[PDB]
Each structure stands twice: as structure tokens, then as C-alpha cells.
Enzyme design. Sequence first.
Site, short mmCIF file in Angstrom:
data_model
loop_
_atom_site.label_atom_id
_atom_site.label_comp_id
_atom_site.label_asym_id
_atom_site.label_seq_id
_atom_site.Cartn_x
_atom_site.Cartn_y
_atom_site.Cartn_z
N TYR A 76 50.75 31.85 -64.46
CA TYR A 76 50.58 33.28 -64.17
C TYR A 76 49.38 33.88 -64.89
O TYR A 76 49.13 33.60 -66.06
CB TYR A 76 51.84 34.09 -64.51
CG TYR A 76 52.85 34.19 -63.37
CD1 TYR A 76 53.35 33.05 -62.74
CD2 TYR A 76 53.30 35.44 -62.92
CE1 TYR A 76 54.27 33.13 -61.71
CE2 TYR A 76 54.23 35.54 -61.89
CZ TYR A 76 54.70 34.38 -61.28
OH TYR A 76 55.62 34.44 -60.25
N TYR A 119 53.29 39.79 -56.90
CA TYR A 119 52.70 40.14 -55.60
C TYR A 119 53.27 41.42 -55.00
O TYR A 119 52.51 42.25 -54.52
CB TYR A 119 52.85 39.01 -54.58
CG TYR A 119 52.00 37.78 -54.82
CD1 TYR A 119 50.65 37.88 -55.20
CD2 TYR A 119 52.54 36.52 -54.63
CE1 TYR A 119 49.88 36.73 -55.40
CE2 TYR A 119 51.79 35.37 -54.84
CZ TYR A 119 50.47 35.49 -55.22
OH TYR A 119 49.74 34.34 -55.41
N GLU A 173 47.45 29.83 -57.52
CA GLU A 173 48.09 29.17 -56.37
C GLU A 173 47.40 27.87 -55.98
O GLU A 173 48.07 26.90 -55.62
CB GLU A 173 48.22 30.08 -55.15
CG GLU A 173 49.01 31.36 -55.39
CD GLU A 173 50.50 31.18 -55.62
OE1 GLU A 173 51.00 30.05 -55.77
OE2 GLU A 173 51.19 32.23 -55.66
N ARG A 176 48.57 25.30 -58.38
CA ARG A 176 49.94 24.90 -58.07
C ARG A 176 50.05 24.00 -56.85
O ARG A 176 50.89 23.10 -56.81
CB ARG A 176 50.83 26.12 -57.85
CG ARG A 176 51.08 26.97 -59.08
CD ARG A 176 51.72 28.28 -58.67
NE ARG A 176 51.82 29.19 -59.81
CZ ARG A 176 51.57 30.49 -59.76
NH1 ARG A 176 51.18 31.08 -58.63
NH2 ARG A 176 51.68 31.22 -60.87
#
Length: 263
Positions: A76, A119, A173, A176
Site C-alpha cells: 500500500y 479506492y 497493483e 502484485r
Amino acid sequence: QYPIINFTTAGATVQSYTNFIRAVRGRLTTGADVRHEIPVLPNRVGLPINQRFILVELSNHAELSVTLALDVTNAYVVGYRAGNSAYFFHPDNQEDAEAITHLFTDVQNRYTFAFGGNYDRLEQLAGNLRENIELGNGPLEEAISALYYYSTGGTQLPTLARSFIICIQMISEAARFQYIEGEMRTRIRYNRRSAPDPSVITLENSWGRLSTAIQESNQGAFASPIQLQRRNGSKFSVYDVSILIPIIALMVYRCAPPPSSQF
């Protein structure tokens, strides 16, 4: 103290972006935890503060720089620094609030946003959903400038929120998911900006669930299927870790791995 990874949008290529994402993953994970060929991020429980964060220094063609702070437990983006000011998303708990006091300690002006960095919150502030926010090298170039100019009044809150949304997807992202990294590589290769399709969105939304399903699986087999979406929005059912090996690059820690239990 914390490791720094540098990336620039200035003349970015598929290769320079690939190098960047690889370096981010290398600093996020230790290699201590790999399950069904998929690495797991460090467990938050008992993680020393000197190992808690990494720094991503983003530069652009406009000759501006911002530094994002990433939490290694979940990748994060917890906040950013631009010159004399640093800004942090509203912490979820007291432990996280203490943790962020170890970031950008020599900065003149420290701020905590009253809003969280998820988000849902960022989309509502942006006035746009992820499905309508264009991603690519151009958007990232512009996002870096928008983050840079926030403290001096040049950036409206919806633009700031949109800029965070861009950064999170193109960095966290992509780290990930090899699949999302691939989608960003494509945008860079052709220098064509576009909003993320349902395959990207559903992967983002399902990261926690996919991480848990893999880690709680019986030898890789899910107890319950997970529904994802294809590029055209149609359903794709996931029953097993096997199909996810080319898709997911790292998982959030969710449980202890069960004993090896070889036959």
C-alpha cells in the site's frame, strides 16, 4: 534507512518499467515465504519498524520528483513526499499511525489527510471510478506533476485523488500482479493511455480474497471458486492456484502455511 527504488516516466520503455517493477518486488519480499510458486509479503505481526517500508522515487520529464512510501506488508501507498511537505493517508489503526512517524523524518511540513487511501474513498474524491481513469506513461507523468504541486495550491483535490489512483495501479497493483504489469507494459510500448478493463479491476478487487484462497487451499484446490472477469466483462471462474501462477506475483500474508504433508 529505508530502501529507495527510482523510476522515471521520462523516456520510459517496456524494459525500464519492467526493471522498476522487478526491483519493487525484490524490496517488498524477502524470499522467506513462497507458496505454490507465489511469493508472500512479510507478516505484519512482529515485523520490526526498520523493515516496514520501501520508498519509490518517481521522476518525470518535467524534471519533478515525488517519493511514495509503500508498506511492505501489503504494498500500500501510505503517503508521499514532495520537497518540503509530506502527506499521509488517514491511518487505519494506532500501530499504523506510529509506523508512519518513521517516514520522511527530516521533512519540514507533515500532514495527515483526514481521508483514507482506499479506492472507494479516492474514487469518490476524484469524481471518477477506476474504470474511467486512464492509465499509462502519460497519466503517470501528469500524476507526478499533480502530486508535486499540491502543497502550493496548483492541484485540486479531485486531480490529486485521480493521481493517487494512477500511481497505486501502475506501481502497487503492477507489483502484485504480473498480469497488471503486462497491461501497463502494453500501454508504455505503444504510448497509448487507456482506462483499465474489467480483467484489471476484478483482479485489484480480488487481491485479498485470492491471497486467502491460495493460502487456505487444500494442496492448491480452492474450497470455494472465485469469480473474476475477462477483458469483455464475462465471468472467469478460478478453482485452483495453478491458473493464477502467471497472474499473481505476490500475496498479502493471511495465514501460516500448513505443514508440507508430502505423501
